[PDB]
Amino acid sequence: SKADKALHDKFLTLDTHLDTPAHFGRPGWDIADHHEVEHDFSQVDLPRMNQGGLDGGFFVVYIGQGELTEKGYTYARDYALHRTIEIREMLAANPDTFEMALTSDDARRIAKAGKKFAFVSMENSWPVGEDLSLVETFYKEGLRMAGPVHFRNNQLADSSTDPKGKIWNGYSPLGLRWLAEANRLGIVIDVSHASDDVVDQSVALSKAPIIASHSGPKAVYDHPRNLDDARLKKIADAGGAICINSIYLTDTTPSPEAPDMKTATPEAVKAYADKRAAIDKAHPAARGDFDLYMKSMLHVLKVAGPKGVCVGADWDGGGGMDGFEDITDLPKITARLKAEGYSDADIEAIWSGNVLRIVDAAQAYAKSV
Amino acid sequence: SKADKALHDKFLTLDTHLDTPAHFGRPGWDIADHHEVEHDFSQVDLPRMNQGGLDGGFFVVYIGQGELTEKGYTYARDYALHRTIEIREMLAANPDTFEMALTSDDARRIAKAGKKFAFVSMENSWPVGEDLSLVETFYKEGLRMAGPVHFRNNQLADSSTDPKGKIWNGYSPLGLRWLAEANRLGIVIDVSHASDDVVDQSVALSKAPIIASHSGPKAVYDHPRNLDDARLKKIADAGGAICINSIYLTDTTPSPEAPDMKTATPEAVKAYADKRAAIDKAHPAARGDFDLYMKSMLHVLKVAGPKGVCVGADWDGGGGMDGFEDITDLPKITARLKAEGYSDADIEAIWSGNVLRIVDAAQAYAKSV
Ligand SMILES: [Cl-]
Ligand SMILES: [Cl-]
Ligand SMILES: [Zn+2]
Ligand SMILES: [Zn+2]
Ligand SMILES: [Zn+2]
Ligand SMILES: [Zn+2]
Secondary structure (H helix, E strand, O other): OHHHHHHHOOOOOEEEEEOOHHHHOOOOOOOOOOOOHHHHOOOOOHHHHHHOOOOEEEEEEEOOOOOOOHHHHHHHHHHHHHHHHHHHHHHHHOOOOEEEOOOHHHHHHHHHOOOEEEEEEEEOOHHHOOOOHHHHHHHHOOEEEEEOOOOOOOOOEOEOOOOOOOOOOOEOHHHHHHHHHHHHHOOEEEOOOEOHHHHHHHHHHOOOOOEEEEEOEOOOOOOOOOEOHHHHHHHHHOOOEEEEOOOOOOOOOOOOOOOOOOOOOHHHHHHHHHHHHHHHHHOOOOOOEHHHHHHHHHHHHHHHOOOOEEEOOOOOOOOOEEOEOOHHHOHHHHHHHHHOOOOHHHHHHHHHHHHHHHHHHHHHHHHHO | OHHHHHHHOOOOOEEEEEOOHHHHOOOOOOOOOOOOHHHHOOOOOHHHHHHHOOOEEEEEEEOOOOOOOHHHHHHHHHHHHHHHHHHHHHHHHOOOOEEEOOOHHHHHHHHHOOOEEEEEEEEOOHHHOOOOHHHHHHHHOOEEEEEOOOOOOOOOEOEOOOOOOOOOOOEOHHHHHHHHHHHHHOOEEEOOOEOHHHHHHHHHHOOOOOEEEEEEEOOOOOOOOEEOHHHHHHHHHOOOEEEEOOOOOOOOOOOOOOOOOOOOOHHHHHHHHHHHHHHHHHOOOOOOEHHHHHHHHHHHHHHHOOOOEEEOOOOOOOOOEEOEOOHHHOHHHHHHHHHOOOOHHHHHHHHHHHHHHHHHHHHHHHHHO
16 A cells, blocks of 8 residues: 555664574575565565565574584584674675664664665574673674573573473573673663563663563463563563564464475475465465454553564564565554554654664663773 | 786686785775775785786785783684675675685686685684684685784794794694694695794694795795795695795895874875875885796795795785786786796696695595595
């Protein structure tokens, strides 16, 4: 709807968890090209950012949880460094359309120049190993938001989803030092994936507001990956925010009825995409729809307020629902917010204001020391 | 001379020590632009690579020797990682004219496609600190040639020029392990800057041929930075080679008669360049000339043979002589070699064949284990 795009276009938009960097190392993949989620599996690229009115976001440096050993740590360090480098290479290859942002002023300046701004975030800090000086290493290369853990516990903190249960009851002693270093450098702490203990300790100990880069409310869907109302409010009352995820909102159990993207031939990739597409069409996956996404956002808005909510759909990280396939559908969020009675001020806060405020606060504290 | 360029153009050329990366971080500096050594201080860029017929080379990740402390090592690690990243950014910004090479096949393939090939080398391995796993970290980002030390001794080995003398009498115990790791990964060991003890131990212990990325013969000029005939032959007899340097060939003592390039204003840089130029014109520095460069090359050729000699002039690292100001003068080397009676086969070996053979051997050993 051109009417929706017009309204949407008036706001500075950003998503706090673009997993798109996972595609950067794919042979011949170019963010400048237009892709189809059905054929490429990607949900983000420049053409679609323009079509969906997405002005920028936090490009994720993500790594799955591996061994808590010296070999695991060295592997993780190198892997994350390389993923960070891939992001910097994308930016170096697209200077006229993209630019790295380190501060909120950078974001606004880049936006005014007509370019997409790219902040850098980390999902799973397993890569720092036992050497916290690596946090600054990543900071020097652009890191401005980081979560200590992913799906399983690591040397820094407990995950909300580890099948083996808790081991630290929040942050490990090393993790507490990690939190202190993130605060000192001015990196926004991301609790998405972390256990409730980590959330509680983060709010209690962090010198700056924290964030949940991609989470939801247990009130809408009871899953460890979501937060109860009390914690949503706690994060918000401390100046933080929760960015709305598009998954963990419904039972995805499938009805009774992949190649290495970094080395597979373009034909091979097309092959699986085609088979997959047919399967998804014959027996659609249970993902919920756009109304469900707004149901989640609206509930968090009620509990955390318009200043404690943001957008983090998990694009390229498994996100997506019926009527919310990729970023081209983002304008629908702005439409529903208006239709729900939210002012432009609140919509602006939700699309970027709240996140940029959190970034400012984190970096303000860092400067103060 | 178009006649010289025609001959020169027939060979695949590469220099083993392009310090050019030191300019990559300079504000607005672009390798695609044409520069004048007199105004920009640079001796390498795409236009001049084309004019001089330089097909590629090893782009250096260099760092001066600092403190042998935890603080020094973390600083060195981060610095070298950033310099490596700057090189990768240059490559990402110039995909149609440049491409990173990891193997000799890459070099030839890239050359055939009409692009300049860029290998990555390290000068001073101080950045690995006490953590040898970092060697692989750099390897994963492109490192294929590395020297353990620079002007002063470090935690890995003795330098040939440290004013305080020797401390390890070659490699330290950590340095021996470093040599073993370089061999295991398939990184070519570079002894330029290392003490004679390091040279002797490298030939005796290395599982693969080694190289002197930019050195000369003591026979022509007696300086610690050059090698005696016995060591030249030793390196060659082990399958290695010595790449001819353009400095340390004459007494540079000046007759009786600079801003931060990364932060100075284009005008300020021009200012110094102009003053400097006038000074260099009024009272030329003692640098020798092109004949002296060939005198060095010819002597090493006599001792090491046509299979143990290569080119490493120290461009952007202090190299240059009268009649050999920058890479536009490279064709003169090919002319003199012919004029001296060397076949095309030998000239080809000297310009790239020998180096690529050494790279192949290093990587062949790595694969074998
Ligand atoms: Cl997730
Ligand atoms: Cl030198
Ligand atoms: Zn993710
Ligand atoms: Zn996630
Ligand atoms: Zn150098
Ligand atoms: Zn040097």
